[PDB]
Design an enzyme around this catalytic site. Structure first.
Site, PDB file in Angstrom:
ATOM      1  N   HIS A 129       0.773  -1.249   0.000  1.00  0.00           N
ATOM      2  CA  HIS A 129       0.000   0.000   0.000  1.00  0.00           C
ATOM      3  C   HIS A 129       0.797   1.287   0.000  1.00  0.00           C
ATOM      4  CE1 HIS A 129      -3.726  -2.094   0.270  1.00  0.00           C
ATOM      5  NE2 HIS A 129      -3.456  -2.614   1.454  1.00  0.00           N
ATOM      6  N   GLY A 137      -2.305   1.907   5.033  1.00  0.00           N
ATOM      7  CA  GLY A 137      -2.695   0.538   5.315  1.00  0.00           C
ATOM      8  C   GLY A 137      -1.559  -0.281   5.895  1.00  0.00           C
ATOM      9  N   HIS A 166      -6.777  -7.179  -0.284  1.00  0.00           N
ATOM     10  CA  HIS A 166      -6.789  -5.806  -0.748  1.00  0.00           C
ATOM     11  C   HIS A 166      -6.087  -5.584  -2.084  1.00  0.00           C
ATOM     12  CE1 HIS A 166      -7.513  -5.687   3.546  1.00  0.00           C
ATOM     13  NE2 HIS A 166      -7.970  -4.454   3.434  1.00  0.00           N
ATOM     14  N   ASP A 253      -4.885 -12.534   4.484  1.00  0.00           N
ATOM     15  CA  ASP A 253      -6.125 -11.924   4.940  1.00  0.00           C
ATOM     16  C   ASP A 253      -7.314 -12.290   4.057  1.00  0.00           C
ATOM     17  OD1 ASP A 253      -5.267 -10.417   2.748  1.00  0.00           O
ATOM     18  OD2 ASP A 253      -5.082  -8.529   3.876  1.00  0.00           O
TER      19      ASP A 253
HETATM   20  C1  LIG Z   1      -6.191  -1.109   6.377  1.00  0.00           C
HETATM   21  C2  LIG Z   1      -6.634  -2.533   6.731  1.00  0.00           C
HETATM   22  C3  LIG Z   1      -5.977  -3.730   6.115  1.00  0.00           C
HETATM   23  C4  LIG Z   1      -4.951  -3.675   5.195  1.00  0.00           C
HETATM   24  C5  LIG Z   1      -4.333  -4.893   4.597  1.00  0.00           C
HETATM   25  O1  LIG Z   1      -4.704  -6.028   4.900  1.00  0.00           O
HETATM   26  N1  LIG Z   1      -3.345  -4.745   3.689  1.00  0.00           N
HETATM   27  O2  LIG Z   1      -2.735  -5.873   3.086  1.00  0.00           O
HETATM   28  C6  LIG Z   1      -7.657  -2.782   7.615  1.00  0.00           C
HETATM   29  C7  LIG Z   1      -8.497  -1.735   8.371  1.00  0.00           C
HETATM   30  C8  LIG Z   1      -9.772  -1.443   7.553  1.00  0.00           C
HETATM   31  C9  LIG Z   1      -8.866  -2.277   9.774  1.00  0.00           C
HETATM   32  O3  LIG Z   1      -9.769  -3.116   9.875  1.00  0.00           O
HETATM   33  C10 LIG Z   1      -8.144  -1.819  11.025  1.00  0.00           C
HETATM   34  C11 LIG Z   1      -8.516  -2.374  12.333  1.00  0.00           C
HETATM   35  C12 LIG Z   1      -7.847  -1.978  13.514  1.00  0.00           C
HETATM   36  C13 LIG Z   1      -6.764  -0.996  13.465  1.00  0.00           C
HETATM   37  N2  LIG Z   1      -6.057  -0.582  14.674  1.00  0.00           N
HETATM   38  C14 LIG Z   1      -6.402  -1.142  16.007  1.00  0.00           C
HETATM   39  C15 LIG Z   1      -4.952   0.419  14.626  1.00  0.00           C
HETATM   40  C16 LIG Z   1      -6.402  -0.435  12.158  1.00  0.00           C
HETATM   41  C17 LIG Z   1      -7.067  -0.833  10.974  1.00  0.00           C
HETATM   42  K   LIG Z   2      -4.664  -8.375  -4.098  1.00  0.00           K
HETATM   43 ZN   LIG Z   3      -4.711  -6.791   2.854  1.00  0.00          ZN
END
Ligand SMILES: CC(/C=C/C(=O)NO)=C\[C@@H](C)C(=O)c1ccc(N(C)C)cc1
Ligand SMILES: [K+]
Ligand SMILES: [Zn+2]
Ligand SMILES: CC(/C=C/C(=O)NO)=C\[C@@H](C)C(=O)c1ccc(N(C)C)cc1
Ligand SMILES: [K+]
Length: 364
Positions: A129, A137, A166, A253
């Site tokens: 990202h 991300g 993603h 994921d």
């Molecule tokens: C950005 C992402 C995954 C990226 C990925 O998988 N890239 O490969 C997920 C977000 C929506 C999320 O659900 C989230 C949950 C808790 C949190 N903190 C407790 C700091 C920070 C973000």
């Molecule tokens: K992908």
């Molecule tokens: Zn991801």
């Protein structure tokens, strides 16, 4: 040679889960428990230098990572301007962490260039990202891009395949205008789903037109479907692009049980996608990525390392440090949830065709 490089080092693993639950340790620990490390060539990762990281990221941004890394997420004026926030926490060690990851991936690429192997692995990498001057991300440094840039010092055409749930936007954006590197990403595309890009009509720009391939997929897809799709696209990309090297990020994921509760995949499904690519016999850089059921992430990657070695692993989780993390059941296999697969077979077909079409305009 002919024997896989495994980028690892007790210090490197300590740094990876030094901020963000300790996951690097569980992954290596389960691989070690299966004795897979004995069948690979363990190579200590180097730490990326500023020059190396500057190959893609701007110094203004890299310097900011230092500053913040050294102090903290303190009221710093430029943090928002650089992506640091809830999604990409500002903290102490941030710069060192990025540098180790960037180096690990760059090191793996070096091994591939030097003919030390045909497959080089860095499970702690694959943070697709990051932008050139912005964090995103959970990616502070786009190690994949750095690896691709490094590989190009030797391989004319690089094929990047992103199987993270993603969209691999950081990587795609980096090579959007070139045809020297092709990015293909299978991911979830839905309203409000991070990062929000990657629709199927996203094909690149300028000389890069048709060199960006995106496969939007919906919730609940399972092994069979996924492989049909993935193999369909890859077979066409291999013919149309003719890669000389491959970078493949395998974020877990997408696996059944993940907190992302989106796809319904098992490591066997991904492993089939991996065997397909391996069959090509091209220099391949394997990367990690997403994956937030820690135990599930380690289960997956331990299984993929097995696939890489062409070795069968036992269903029973070997005893080791993090053994109690492996479930009521303590087995390797993962079972897909009882959620529906909202992927209408018709639209998937419209997508495959649209991609087949765009890959027509590709001629090396
Ligand atoms: C950005 C992402 C995954 C990226 C990925 O998988 N890239 O490969 C997920 C977000 C929506 C999320 O659900 C989230 C949950 C808790 C949190 N903190 C407790 C700091 C920070 C973000
Ligand atoms: K992908
Ligand atoms: Zn991801
Ligand atoms: C994304 C998430 C939960 C999502 C959810 O609950 N979605 O519904 C939790 C974060 C804190 C997490 O576990 C994590 C693990 C490893 C890592 N790196 C190895 C960089 C970065 C983040
Ligand atoms: K491209």
């Amino acid at each position: 040679s002919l024997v896989p490089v495994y980028i690892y080092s007790p210090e490197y693993v300590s740094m990876c889960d030094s901020l963000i639950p300790k996951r690097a340790s569980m992954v290596h620990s389960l691989i070690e428990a299966y004795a897979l490390h004995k069948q690979m060539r363990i190579v200590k990762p180097k730490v990326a230098s500023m020059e190396e990281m500057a190959t893609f990221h701007t110094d203004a941004y890299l310097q900011h990572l230092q500053k913040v890394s050294q102090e903290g997420d303190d009221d710093h004026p430029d943090s928002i301007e650089y992506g640091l926030g809830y999604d990409c926490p500002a903290t102490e060690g941030i710069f060192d962490y990025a540098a180790a990851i960037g180096g690990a991936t760059i090191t793996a690429a070096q091994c591939l260039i030097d003919g030390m192997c045909k497959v080089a692995i860095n499970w702690s990498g694959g943070w697709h990202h990051a932008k050139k001057d912005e964090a995103s991300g959970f990616c502070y440094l786009n190690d994949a891009v750095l690896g691709i840039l490094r590989l190009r010092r030797k391989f004319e055409r690089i094929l990047y395949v992103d199987l993270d749930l993603h969209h691999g936007d950081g990587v795609e954006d980096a090579f959007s205008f070139t045809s020297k590197v092709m990015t293909v990403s299978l991911h979830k595309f839905s309203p409000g789903f991070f990062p929000g890009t990657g629709d199927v009509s996203d094909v690149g720009l300028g000389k890069g037109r048709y060199y960006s391939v995106n496969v939007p997929i919906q919730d609940g897809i399972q092994d069979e479907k996924y492989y049909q799709i993935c193999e369909s696209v890859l077979k066409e990309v291999y013919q149309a692009f003719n890669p000389k090297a491959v970078v493949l990020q395998l974020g877990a994921d997408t696996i059944a049980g993940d907190p992302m509760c989106s796809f319904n995949m098992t490591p066997v499904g991904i492993g089939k996608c991996l065997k397909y690519i391996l069959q090509w016999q091209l220099a391949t850089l394997i990367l990690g990525g997403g994956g937030y059921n820690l135990a599930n992430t380690a289960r997956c990657w331990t299984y993929l390392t097995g696939v890489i070695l062409g070795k069968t692993l036992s269903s029973e989780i070997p005893d080791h440090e993090f053994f109690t993390a492996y479930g009521p059941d303590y087995v390797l296999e993962i079972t897909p949830s009882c959620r529906p697969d909202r992927n209408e077979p018709h639209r998937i077909q419209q997508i495959l065709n649209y991609i087949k079409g765009n890959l027509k305009h590709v001629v090396i």
